[PDB]
Write a protein that binds this ligand. Structure first.
Ligand SMILES: CC(=O)N1CCN(c2ccc(Cl)cc2)CC1
Ligand SMILES: CC(=O)N1CCN(c2ccc(Cl)cc2)CC1
Lengths: 269, 268
């Protein structure tokens, strides 16, 4: 991997592994999400930011401040097959008062065609209190020199899917998968549940018949609260719709405290 | 990756990824196990065998025959750190009547030192009936041309840790983690639970204090029965001692055994 010529974005190539593919012999959306996270981590390492997933500065670290994902939106046109080389380009931009954004473009290395795209919205928060806080000018100034300042969007369209408001699923859910718990492989280096695990938990309540006869085209996920190492989660799904659409909700098994909500769009094979 | 000069082994390099490391910022044993499986798959692809994990021949495929792991034994001296390059060499050998074997040597790419080693025993069986079958001479002959015929062992010590018999844990277990279920990420391309998931399930019943103050040095795991997509598993552990543990994975309901194993941990 390497920063591009203008130093305002980062590119990396990946060969799809045997354990990274699903029933179609192509990479799963969780393998894609792991790769987006990996290239974001390598971009941070390339310019001196933390490499723990929070991409902090020394100033943020002494104030116990971190960057946290508020929303992840992924759209895949073609899932790469086992042994294929996928090239991923990533960049970040400030959105002032709303927070910050990281975008990605996935391409087939052989043809150069865009096979997928993703965007994520981030907010600054105190690590201990979990209270959101506005980024100071002195912290912001350290990041702007690594971002393009002219808008560069992976999703430029007028009222695109990445910005749509997601409603809360109402009981009873059409489908459910209960008692989901994270194991040590689901945790990052700081013992937090990896964002990719929540994607897997959302998809667990999709009926296998849909998975067998459709391909996942779009996934949007809002992150409201962290699932702790010892928490148990319920995954709820209701069909909202050639295409199938679902509304999703992840909540704690006991009190029903919401941790995530999202929507998925599937296309018939 | 590539076959070596003599064509009797295969080598591949891997750079450790950010999501592949544990609290020590070094690769987990599950990341190592995934890499061993990956290099075994690439070795099969490089000489025309199936690439689904069963490394079958056309003849085996028409008879519904597969190679299945009976035992996996891994010993790690140094876990590679995030961003390090690890080189893995793998080869396979026939053990006649006992079944077959795949071995691996892990090295630090920069220094060339051996950082780990692994061995696995395989048996042939019918995929539908699950009955073990003796390998025919015509099937065996297709594989021998890709194996060294002089013994080449990752664990040569006479009656070493890789060959020790594992006893069955007796109730009550000292520690337990119950109700473990596989999700779609735990399945391979043919919807079977990946062997690496069972390693993760075994380790779930190790107390976090041990994980926090020790490094896993050796793991031996016997595979008795497959956990299906809709099965629920209980993971049991009892200290037998460095720290040593006896492990047992069984179905949550009837207590049917799926795996047994032992782990050895070294104080940090
Ligand atoms: C970990 C990660 O991908 N991100 C998204 C981009 N981030 C960012 C922060 C400040 C400014 Cl001015 C611009 C961008 C925060 C961290
Ligand atoms: C999947 C896997 O790792 N293996 C290695 C050992 N195998 C093998 C079979 C026959 C002979 Cl003669 C030698 C070796 C089966 C495939």
């Amino acid at each position: 991997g390497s920063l591009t010529e203008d130093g305002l974005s980062y590119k990396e190539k990946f060969v799809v592994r045997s354990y990274e593919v699903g029933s179609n012999k192509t990479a799963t959306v969780e393998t894609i999400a792991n790769l987006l996270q990996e290239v974001g981590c390598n971009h941070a390492q390339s310019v001196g930011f933390s490499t723990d997933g929070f991409a902090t500065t020394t100033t943020m670290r002494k104030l116990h401040l971190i960057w946290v994902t508020a929303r992840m939106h992924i759209e895949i046109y073609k899932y790469p097959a086992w042994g294929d080389v996928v090239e991923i380009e990533t960049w970040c931009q400030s959105e002032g008062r709303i927070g910050t954004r990281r975008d990605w473009i996935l391409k087939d290395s052989v043809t150069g065609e865009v096979t997928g795209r993703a965007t994520s919205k981030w907010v600054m928060m105190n690590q201990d209190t979990r209270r959101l806080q506005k980024v100071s000018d002195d912290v912001r100034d350290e990041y702007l020199v690594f971002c393009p300042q002219e808008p560069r969007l992976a999703f430029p369209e007028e009222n695109n899917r990445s910005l749509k408001k997601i409603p809360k699923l109402e009981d009873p859910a059409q489908y459910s998968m209960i008692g989901l718990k994270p194991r040590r492989a689901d945790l990052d280096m700081n013992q937090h549940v990896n964002n990719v695990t929540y994607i897997g938990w959302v998809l667990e309540s999709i009926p296998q018949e849909i998975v067998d006869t459709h391909e996942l085209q779009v996934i949007t996920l809002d992150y409201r609260r962290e699932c702790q190492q010892d928490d148990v989660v319920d995954s709820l799904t209701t069909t909202t719709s050639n295409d199938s659409q679902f509304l999703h909700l992840l909540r704690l098994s006991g009190d029903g405290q919401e941790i995530n909500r999202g929507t998925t769009l599937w296309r018939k094979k």
